[PDB]
């Protein structure tokens, strides 16, 4: 958390390009005098989003054999444009703050558990992220009364069934294929 990590990410160019936006350069330095090329946006449904490894605020250090640590904005764009159909990126990022994993036991009310979910493979709630997210908690429902679950929580598992890289419909099935008492594994920021 807060420390630098370095990663090789190879992307295959799709019809709409690599599927991300950049800012920075020696002539457009955002944040102090740091000339780094940064990712500012991951395009929904694009190559970077489907791959899932590239993150907003990652700094691109190399594009294939080209050093983009101290280049103009235009030089970076050109290097990415000319990089071919298989693009090998070497990036740097500050590790995000760690998430708290929590177990929550809920008893269903007459209207279920009282929350809504979004996300899944092909329905990413955040571009690049296949996780199931809580998007709504029903006033007066079981999740609300318990008080632990919150909007923006990630559902990792329901009872013994993992929800890592699953389709949205399977996440719903798993959450509805339950008895009255449900055990949830949850990731909080």
């Amino acid at each position: 958390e807060g420390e630098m990590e370095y990663e090789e990410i190879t992307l295959e160019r799709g019809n709409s390009g690599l599927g991300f936006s950049i800012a920075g350069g020696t002539d457009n330095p955002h944040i102090g005098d740091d000339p780094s090329i940064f990712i500012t946006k991951i395009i929904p449904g694009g190559a970077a989003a489907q791959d899932g490894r590239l993150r907003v605020n990652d700094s691109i250090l190399f594009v294939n054999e080209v050093d983009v640590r101290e280049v103009t904005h235009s030089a970076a764009v050109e290097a990415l444009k000319e990089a071919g159909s298989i693009v090998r990126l070497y990036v740097m990022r500050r590790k995000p703050p760690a998430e708290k994993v929590m177990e929550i036991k809920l008893i269903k009310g007459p209207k279920g558990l009282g929350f809504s979910i979004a996300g899944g493979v092909g329905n990413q709630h955040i571009p690049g992220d296949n996780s199931i997210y809580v998007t709504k908690i029903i006033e007066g429902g079981a999740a609300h009364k318990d008080g632990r679950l919150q909007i923006g929580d990630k559902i990792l598992a329901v009872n013994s069934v993992g929800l890592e890289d699953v389709m949205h419909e399977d996440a719903v099935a798993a959450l509805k294929n339950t008895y009255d008492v449900v055990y949830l594994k949850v990731a909080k920021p």
Binding site: G112, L113, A118, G120, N123, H168
Partner: peptide
């Protein structure tokens, strides 16, 4: 994107 009730 989808949103479902649980």
């Amino acid at each position: 994107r989808r949103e479902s009730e649980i």
